[PDB]
RNA sequence: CUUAAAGAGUCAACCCUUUGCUUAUCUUCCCUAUUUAAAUGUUAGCAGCCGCAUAGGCUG
């Protein structure tokens, strides 16, 4: 199994997330938990937010 | 300015063959269709003869 199987059974990602297996592991997990952004080849719609619109990109 | 914006699914074909749904059946008794009454509505628009008339008159 790759990392995707082991992190997703028996609530293992929440176990590393709440640090039952270690706070330095919490760090390792969060070092991979980042927000990378790209808006190309994605839908961009307008949603009314009250007297104006927001360009929502639904992911 | 709508998970906005955009897009060629194309092609091809042997469903075969086989077959016993036969067998025997009581439908059946019953019994009131009874009674009337204008056909009226002129109920016919005819037969000859006087005539050129299929115009018009006469005769019963």
Automatic annotation (TrEMBL):
Q: What is this protein called?
A: Uncharacterized protein
| Range of the intact protein held here | 60 to 118 of 179
């Amino acid at each position: 199994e790759n990392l995707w199987q082991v992190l997703n059974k028996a609530n293992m990602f929440y176990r590393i997330y709440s640090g039952e297996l270690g706070e330095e592991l919490q760090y390792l997990l969060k070092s991979c938990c980042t927000a990378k952004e790209d808006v190309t080849t994605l839908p961009q719609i307008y949603f009314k937010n009250g007297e104006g619109y927001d360009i929502l990109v639904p992911i």
